Structure 1
Amino acid sequence: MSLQEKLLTYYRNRAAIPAGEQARAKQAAVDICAELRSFLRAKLPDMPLRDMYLSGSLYDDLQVVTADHIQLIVPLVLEQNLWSCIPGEDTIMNVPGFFLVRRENPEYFPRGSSYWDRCVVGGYLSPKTVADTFEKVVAGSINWPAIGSLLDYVIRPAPPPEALTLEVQYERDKHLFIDFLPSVTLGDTVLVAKPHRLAQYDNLWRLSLRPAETARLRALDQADSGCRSLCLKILKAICKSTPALGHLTASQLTNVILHLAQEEADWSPDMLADRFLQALRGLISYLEAGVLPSALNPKVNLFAELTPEEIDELGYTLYCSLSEPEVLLQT
């Protein structure tokens, strides 16, 4: 049979979402998203935000390759007057590519001049505070299954520390997750409050990379009708199924593939199996080294959040795969 054929087989059987189901999944998210606006259009203002949006509603599949959960961005509006963002590199700590947001010009515009002065601690805008002030609309200031009833789904938020995340069964067989993620844009630079992990103590703002990451990927495979996304989807599925490998994230996997695209031109369909093995060796190499640089921002190490016991486990599992990759398909 061969790896190629087995990989394709695993794709269709374990990894891929049927066109129909996918559409219905998109519908759910788009509907949930609509109604959450209707909840905040009533509740607010006070908090200054643009409309919530779902990334990337332009693609059907919705970027659930690159991935984790469907992402519901909530853009916080800030005065470009009153706020500068300081790179994590130039701290006061030392943590690329996270950023501190510094309250500027008390020198001019005293406290109370912004809504966002109520989420400052120590001269700096605080993703955790911001996330919290937020999380106490979610789990559960919402009249939750009243919107469940309206649309014929089950909508319940995961219990903390993911009160931001939501579970929705869209059909009876299947279920689906939606992340709320607060975002601020200060000039060129866009940031999200996905907390760091340790964060020292608590904590900095995270540079958003998923949308750029998914755009390169979309584009490369457009260029040459190549098999980069397919190869990624399969690694993602294997990692979702194989408990040892669960510690690996969408972003990590995505960046392994992007580095491999930098190194290899070919990605014709018949190259799947080789590129697949190379991703495994790439992973092993990045894990040995303890660093996976972001393809888009080489100073950022995506493996910096992994605990060393995780790295340990992953490396061993991958090391053992290499001679019989077939075993990864039967988890």
Structure 2
Amino acid sequence: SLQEKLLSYYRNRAAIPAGEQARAKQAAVDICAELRSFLRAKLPDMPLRDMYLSGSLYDDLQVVTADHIQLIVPLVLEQNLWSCIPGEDTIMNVPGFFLVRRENPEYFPRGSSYWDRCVVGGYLSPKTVADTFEKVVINWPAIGSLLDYVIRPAPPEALTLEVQYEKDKHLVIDFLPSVTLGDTVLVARPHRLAQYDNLWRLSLRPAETARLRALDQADSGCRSLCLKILKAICKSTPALGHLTASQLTNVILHLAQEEADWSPDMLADRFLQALRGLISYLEAGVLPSALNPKVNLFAELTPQEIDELGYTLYCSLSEPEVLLQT
């Protein structure tokens, strides 16, 4: 009956109608295709690659409603002029984040690189880049009419588009600057606290979802289904609002290294293990990344909030119709 409860909860709350999901993503795909050709002509100065889609909607892991997706804005930084410094090596002492430093100004003076205009204190400021990308940025009415969409950028949060693709269907697109030095991929979404605002955030998302997709392909497994049910519960339960998709994804990755068997009838059991696992990580104040275990995925939560989450989850064990209500 937990199985049946879980599959009912998925079909009735976690699942997005197949057409809504397809259309929402296609609208994102259309807008991306059009910006690429547009920005091509207009920005001959900027070391940027083409913007590209990212997020659960793109990878079929969005739940409840298809309402949001990112446009990654990938800067180009040359190796001999920049380095990334992991946060645990900075005085910030926070793994999972990075400082981006302008190297060798003696060899290659300031102004050699376009992004020198975005340097603060010798570091590439994630916020100065975001503001720079924003100020430079496009005829949205023109692009809208070309696709028969209604696209309306937001007032400050000006790096988000509101996209009316169907009559009463909208989705949100936000731009996300990004950088790659070596194998390390970074993203301009600020640490929650202002004093960490010069740090870029390590992005784990593409390797995490590829890991999870590859596992499920190899044996027709139910890891992704379990994830989405978990995402849907947290998304629909305001006391669980602080939990993020990346935390839930890594709960499932640890359990996958513990459990080889994820056949459909294992769903109920795997979900219980994930739920008890989340509770345990919450008790330890630490949820390490399965891909990069030095990273504590609870790093931005306060101990109080961490306490509140475990408490909510502990209560839910004896009131199961408050995780599973629709």
Please give the TM-score of this superposition, normalised by the length of structure 2. 0.92
SS at match of 1:102: strand
Determine the structure 1 residue equivalent to 2:140: 144
State how many pairs are aligned. Answer: 326
Unaligned segments of structure 1, at least 5 residues:
none
- When residues 57 and 300 of structure 1 are mapped into structure 2, their CA distance, relative to the original with a 3 A threshold, is closer
Deviation at 1:227, TM superposition (A): 0.3
Deviation at 1:319, TM superposition (A): 0.9
Q: Is the 8 A contact 1:167 1:178 kept in 2?
A: yes
Deviation at 1:199, TM superposition (A): 5.0
- When residues 303 and 87 of structure 1 are mapped into structure 2, their CA distance, relative to the original with a 3 A threshold, is same
C-alpha distance in 2, partners of 1:68/1:290? 31
C-alpha distance in 1, partners of 2:125/2:261? 45
Deviation at 1:3, TM superposition (A): 1.5
- 1:56-112 CA deviation, whole Å, 9 max, x = no partner? 899763777999942322211112121111111111221112111111111111111
When the two chains are superposed, the root-mean-square deviation of aligned CA atoms in Å is: 2.5
C-alpha distance in 2, partners of 1:163/1:315? 35
C-alpha distance in 2, partners of 1:205/1:241? 29
C-alpha distance in 2, partners of 1:292/1:67? 28
Q: Is the 8 A contact 1:66 1:210 kept in 2?
A: no
2:265 pairs with one of 249, 258, 270: 270
SS at match of 2:170: coil
C-alpha distance in 2, partners of 1:102/1:122? 9
Deviation at 1:121, TM superposition (A): 0.7
Unaligned segments of structure 2, at least 5 residues:
none
C-alpha distance in 2, partners of 1:4/1:64? 19
- When residues 77 and 60 of structure 1 are mapped into structure 2, their CA distance, relative to the original with a 3 A threshold, is closer
SS at match of 2:173: strand
- When residues 274 and 169 of structure 1 are mapped into structure 2, their CA distance, relative to the original with a 3 A threshold, is farther
SS at match of 1:200: helix
Determine the structure 2 residue equivalent to 1:256: 251
- When residues 64 and 11 of structure 1 are mapped into structure 2, their CA distance, relative to the original with a 3 A threshold, is closer
C-alpha distance in 2, partners of 1:294/1:132? 30
Q: Is the 8 A contact 2:36 2:50 kept in 1?
A: yes
- When residues 105 and 89 of structure 1 are mapped into structure 2, their CA distance, relative to the original with a 3 A threshold, is same
- When residues 314 and 60 of structure 1 are mapped into structure 2, their CA distance, relative to the original with a 3 A threshold, is closer
- When residues 157 and 305 of structure 1 are mapped into structure 2, their CA distance, relative to the original with a 3 A threshold, is farther
Report percent identity of matched pairs. Answer: 98
Q: Is the 8 A contact 1:26 1:62 kept in 2?
A: no
- Bigger shift: residues 95-104 or 225-234: 95-104
Q: Is the 8 A contact 2:222 2:267 kept in 1?
A: yes
SS at match of 2:272: helix
Q: Is the 8 A contact 1:101 1:125 kept in 2?
A: yes
- When residues 258 and 77 of structure 1 are mapped into structure 2, their CA distance, relative to the original with a 3 A threshold, is same
C-alpha distance in 2, partners of 1:246/1:109? 47
SS at match of 1:190: strand
- 1:219-254 CA deviation, whole Å, 9 max, x = no partner? 110111010000111111111111111111111111
